[PDB]
Amino acid sequence: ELLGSDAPLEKVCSALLEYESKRKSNLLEDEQDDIEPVWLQLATLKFIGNNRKLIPYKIAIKNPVIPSSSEACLIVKDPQRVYKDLVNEAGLSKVVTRVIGLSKLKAKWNSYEQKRQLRDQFDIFLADDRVIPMLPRILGKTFYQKSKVPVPVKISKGTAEQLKREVVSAYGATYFNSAPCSSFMIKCGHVSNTSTELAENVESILQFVSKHIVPDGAKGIASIHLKTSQSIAIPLWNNPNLKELIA
Amino acid sequence: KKKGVLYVGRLPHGFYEKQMRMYFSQFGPVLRLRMSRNRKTGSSKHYAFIEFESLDVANVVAETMHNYLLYGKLLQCKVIPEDQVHENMFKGADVPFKRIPHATIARLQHEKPLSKEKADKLITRHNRKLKLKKRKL
Amino acid sequence: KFSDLQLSENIQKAIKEMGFETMTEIQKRSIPPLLAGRDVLGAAKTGSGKTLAFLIPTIEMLYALKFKPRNGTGVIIISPTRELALQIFGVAKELLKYHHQTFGIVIGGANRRAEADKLVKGVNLLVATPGRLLDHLQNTKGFVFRNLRSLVIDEADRILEIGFEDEMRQIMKILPSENRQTLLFSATQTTKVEDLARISLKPGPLYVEQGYVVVDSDKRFLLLFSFLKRNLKKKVIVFMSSCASVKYMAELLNYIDLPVLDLHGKQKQQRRTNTFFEFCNAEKGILLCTNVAARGLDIPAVDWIVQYDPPDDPRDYIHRVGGKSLMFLAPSELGFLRYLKTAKVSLNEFEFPANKVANVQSQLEKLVSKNYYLQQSAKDGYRSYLQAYASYSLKSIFDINKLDLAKVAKSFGFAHPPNVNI
Amino acid sequence: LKVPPAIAQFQKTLDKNTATQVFKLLNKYRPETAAEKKQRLVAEAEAVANGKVSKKPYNVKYGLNHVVALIEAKKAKLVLIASDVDPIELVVFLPALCKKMGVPYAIVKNKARLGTVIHQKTAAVLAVTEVREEDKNELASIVSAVDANFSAKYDESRRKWGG
């Protein structure tokens, strides 16, 4: 339903997961908990974006896509000591490995060699809203092209329980960088998550999609497909009355 | 006498065709100036081919301006012998790089509605795209 | 046991604090005749309490005769390698904590100019290796040893196997033989061992699956650090070839928020036992120790056994294993695999990707450079690592000359190799 | 006469651009003046008298004995030798010592330029052993230029008798 009264969720997610599981066919020192991502591609009747908006979309969802064991790096405003103290007393030191001030990020990381070294060190880069416009520079294509876009995590007030709620919010919510196109792809999860969660992660994405990125909502949506990096783009829903909408 | 072509690599960002022309002119005449630029956005590929009026002066610039510590970059200025120089090695030299905004052009295409028949051709094409997957699954 | 033994109050008080008040089978058959002064020719397995077997009666004799540093050395203990000697010296420091008899250790690779300066002050309890003791016996003026009364040989089979056959024969002539107690000790009873006993002991003696990783030296610690981070929730025990190396690595890993326990402690036997017992009790954890420290101790159910430094005794190591086994093998040491082929030991090769190695080297070097106690521990861990390597029994396998020192010190946290003598 | 190779190697100094870049980095790590240092000490002295932790400094190392001991310590990342020491024996071994101990070195123009950096009339030699993390790239870029413009260049000319 939802989009055009024909969205066949649940069953599609189970079928896709079974299809991916069907395609199953030393490394003990080369093993981890990596699971193939679940990919949701959306087709729009018009180019939603005017230009590449180099900030992620905080698509809230209670099923995290980033594993909680991932290492996070906080990019905060000066002074660095205050927020270093904040993460110390809030018990996020194990979760957030490093806190980087903006001045120290602009000075100590100027070469691309240093930028790539920093990028590989951590998995997700959390950034304060107060300074996220800088991170386009100072970081460059070494970040905003190799799937490393800093996230605007709201830490302006700077309180212990506020840090916990934003880090949890950042970890659980899937992320996507908007670019000028009629088509884009969304991270929904991995094969590990059960099919019911993916279908419910998916529906949470479209309702957010119909609200804050697509201006006209389901009317402007062309088609919905579900894909895995090496699998078929199974269509969740196709527009049944798009003929006169584009006319 | 024979034109002296200078490969200037590791070009600091900003030292572009106009800027190279003014700087390299002081050493000697630059018949034409060609800098490699990106496929789409035309951003510098950081190496340019500067053929001077004579090999002799180009040799002077190659010696003077080799390993030049410019903006934290060691400039590489080599006289490339004519044997490796080809006809289009200096193609489009001193010709402005009119970056075609491909992305917005397709955005204008997106804004431009197809002709009603050609729009129906798209709808059927989407129907073909719909039935092409039909036996695909 | 300990209470039954007639050791003096200081020896008894130290023994209670140092360890337990029991008496093992090897000790029970060795303390009585050694205290009486009779020659003892024992044959005991490694890690069976032999260190205390020839220490408590010997220290008691030192107190009984009331030796003074102006009387020179009254006891010499011979050990084949530095690691075994250092463990003995560490235990002897605990035992002599309440007495007044000076103790000291002379081993190869140490400071000869400073070792001789120690000797001329009188070292009433001397731990030594055959290679260096002969040098100090024949070439140091001021070393008083004519008042010697007790000679102890530890692991005579390994001494003869490592290549000290002639070194012992020379030492016997210089060392006094009249009214001197001797105590040979070797599990093996080879004919050459008997020959050494005949030339040294007095007549009428008292008779008693594999897995390896090929990693270059420069990334050895970085590979280990990433591996430990990946397996944080498992029971991991790592063996090393130096007590100085383990002290630094545990100190370094505690610095970077990777809490690891160790059998090193503070060279306090009670603390080492407490750490080992707690580690056995805990279902999850990580511990670093040496082969000698783990020698004689029952290995608990551990998922990963990591041999970060090559073992000193490959003959014992292959039977030592008999979760999963690991071997940090260097490209220059691929010949050690051929030894396992000669020993008929099954093995498999483990591969790692260069992308996942946690390249914190620039930060790791900055920590050691900035900190003082880290730098000294790193410097001493690096020095003891090389000296153990140069003292390995397998010259054909572990060639120090074929080793690259620049890559080794990169793992230890140095941009450039420190200046250590040999 | 015919100048020996060890004394002729000083006539091929560092060029215009690289020396200007080298001195630009040095001038960000100049030592602290006698007049300023007193002001910093009386500020700290006054703080402790009324009522009462710092960070290690970062300055270029100077002095012949101090620097030569820094080369032999493998601590100096860049050694800058004046080209006009009046008794030339004072630095005649410095290029060969730097070659032996694997240190990037350069022979720059005038002791006064090195002297100016450290608020002295004259400096025979200057060494950079540690820089702030913000300027690690700048020192690395300069050292590469010294290798390319001084060590890669000449090279044979320092083994040939001069004059």
Side-chain angles (χ1 to χ4, degrees), chain C residues 87 238-244 246 263 272 288-295:
Chain C
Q87 294 273 349
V238 188
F239 291 156
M240 299 156 148
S241 284
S242 306
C243 191
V246 65
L263 254 72
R272 323 166 87 180
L288 305 152
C289 78
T290 53
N291 299 278
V292 182
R295 189 182 303 276

Side-chain angles (χ1 to χ4, degrees), chain C residues 123-138:
Chain C
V123 179
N124 296 151
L125 173 71
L126 194 76
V127 191
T129 42
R132 183 52 85 84
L133 178 58
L134 186 59
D135 193 49
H136 280 305
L137 277 188
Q138 303 183 333

Side-chain angles (χ1 to χ4, degrees), chain A residues 71 93-94 98 117 120-121, chain C residues 229-230 232 349-353 355-356 358-360 363:
Chain A
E71 302 264 38
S93 297
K94 178 56 133 170
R98 213 193 195 149
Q117 183 274 330
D120 193 316
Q121 267 300 108
Chain C
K229 266 216 302 181
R230 188 184 293 139
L232 60 175
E349 192 267 341
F350 278 66
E351 86 80 11
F352 65 107
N355 155 252
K356 274 195 282 292
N359 41 5
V360 296
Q363 159 184 337

Side-chain angles (χ1 to χ4, degrees), chain C residues 282 285-301:
Chain C
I286 173 175
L287 195 142
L288 305 152
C289 78
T290 53
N291 299 278
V292 182
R295 189 182 303 276
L297 298 185
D298 47 321
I299 45 172

Side-chain angles (χ1 to χ4, degrees), chain C residues 222-232 234-248:
Chain C
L222 281 315
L223 193 146
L224 171 71
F225 175 58
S226 62
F227 159 78
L228 300 179
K229 266 216 302 181
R230 188 184 293 139
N231 285 267
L232 60 175
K234 303 203 162 113
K235 205 158 178 177
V236 195
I237 166 69
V238 188
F239 291 156
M240 299 156 148
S241 284
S242 306
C243 191
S245 300
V246 65
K247 158 183 175 188
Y248 158 70

Side-chain angles (χ1 to χ4, degrees), chain B residues 66-70 72 74, chain D residues 17 21 141 144-145 148-149:
Chain B
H66 195 33
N67 311 321
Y68 186 103
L69 181 59
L70 198 32
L74 278 181
Chain D
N17 171 62
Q21 286 317 107
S141 92
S144 297
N149 291 251

Side-chain angles (χ1 to χ4, degrees), chain D residues 138-155:
Chain D
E138 170 155 9
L139 181 69
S141 92
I142 277 172
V143 153
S144 297
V146 165
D147 127 84
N149 291 251
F150 186 77
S151 289
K153 264 188 56 178
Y154 312 136
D155 213 65

